[PDB]
Every structure is written in structure tokens, then in C-alpha cells.
């Protein structure tokens, strides 16, 4: 009866113009995940998701000061709450 719904939602994630990879398809399960996310920063932002490395994120991404959300956190309730592989792919 308990449902929870509680994965990794109350959280918003922001991408750097793009963060040097497909910021869409990772954005299209964010939605799904309950959680909001955004693309620019004005102060109630200041939350990216750290994909790629070189990603053009590293100017958010390093933040001199301003925090950034680390996007494993959000593989990892996205996987745990989605039950399923998120490439639906690979292999095992």
C-alpha cells in the first residue's frame, strides 16, 4: 500500500548549454524520475548534473563556490526506482 515516491524527487538539475553530450535523453528520464530540472541560473538553480568530464558543465560543474549535484546520485535512484537497465541495452 506504501508507495513511497520518493526516489530523487524535491531536486532540480540544470545542464551547462549542453554539458558536451545528449542533455535531452538524460533530461527525458529526469522527468520521469519526479524531479524537475533546467538549463539556466538565477539563484533557486544552482544544481547541475555531472555527466560527462570535459563537459562544458566545468564552469558549473567546478563552481567556485556555487554547489553542484553530482549525476550518479541520480543514475543511481534512477535505476533503483526504474527496475530496469537505463540504456536498455548492453547486456548484463
Known sequence: ?????E????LTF???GELSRPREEVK???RRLGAKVTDSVSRKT???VVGEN???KLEKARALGVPTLTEEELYRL????TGK????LVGS
Request: charged share 30%; net charge neutral.
Open 1 to 5: 500500500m506504501e508507495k513511497g515516491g
Open 7 to 10: 526516489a530523487l524527487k524535491g
Open 14 to 16: 540544470v545542464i551547462t
Open 28 to 30: 527525458a528520464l529526469l
Open 46 to 48: 544552482s544544481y547541475l
Open 54 to 56: 570535459p563537459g562544458s
Open 78 to 81: 534512477l535505476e533503483a526506482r
Open 85 to 88: 537497465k537505463a540504456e536498455e
